[PDB]
Symmetry: C2
Subunit: 132 residues, 2 copies
Amino acid sequence: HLKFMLNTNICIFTIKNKPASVRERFNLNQGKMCISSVTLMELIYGAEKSQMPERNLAVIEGFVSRIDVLDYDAAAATHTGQIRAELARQGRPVGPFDQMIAGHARSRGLIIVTNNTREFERVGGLRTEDWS
Amino acid sequence: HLKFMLNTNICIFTIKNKPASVRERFNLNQGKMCISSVTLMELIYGAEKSQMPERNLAVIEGFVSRIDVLDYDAAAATHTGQIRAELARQGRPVGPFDQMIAGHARSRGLIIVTNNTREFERVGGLRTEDWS
């Protein structure tokens, strides 16, 4: 059963083993984690813009194979639109991909594991954890 | 068979009947059009931030019922990440949601329908049409 949606920075922390606590908690929870395809997009971008696209792509693919990738669907989109409207009324800036990922997790009742929790606590009805 | 992925502005032009030519070309192509769930997100945002959320939401739901909403999946994400790396190297910017729909359309072999092209004309291998 899926319990966590990992943000991009948490994925990178796991991959770099820094902070090590993140990777250790990732390993603890193998089988219960997913990422949004929005996060997959960010990871692919980091690899393809790097000096070693093929190598870094392989790193991402190996990481991703240990988790599920969830399609950003109509429900995800609908929550996201609602959240953006709510954040705007509140005067609370969240980055555009972060907003999508928040909507995606909320639409699935998942905990967002991210390290910029102050910015995600600005979203209503969302549970977050920092494993770092 | 799906042939077109519509951008947000084209959806709005259709709903508002302005320009009326856009709505007419839309009706013409019913059964052949879709939007990315990324575009659905923007439309829901548009409604929930308005002064009449429930009314505008139903307007969007009614519009959306006549087309397909495609989930932003791994393939869409992958094309998006690549396009961003490519556009970055060319050092010419596209908005974050625009990049996603461009990636989504490319992953599906769809024509992206828009009102002010040029911004999508720089994505390699992407076909565009202007219905304005």
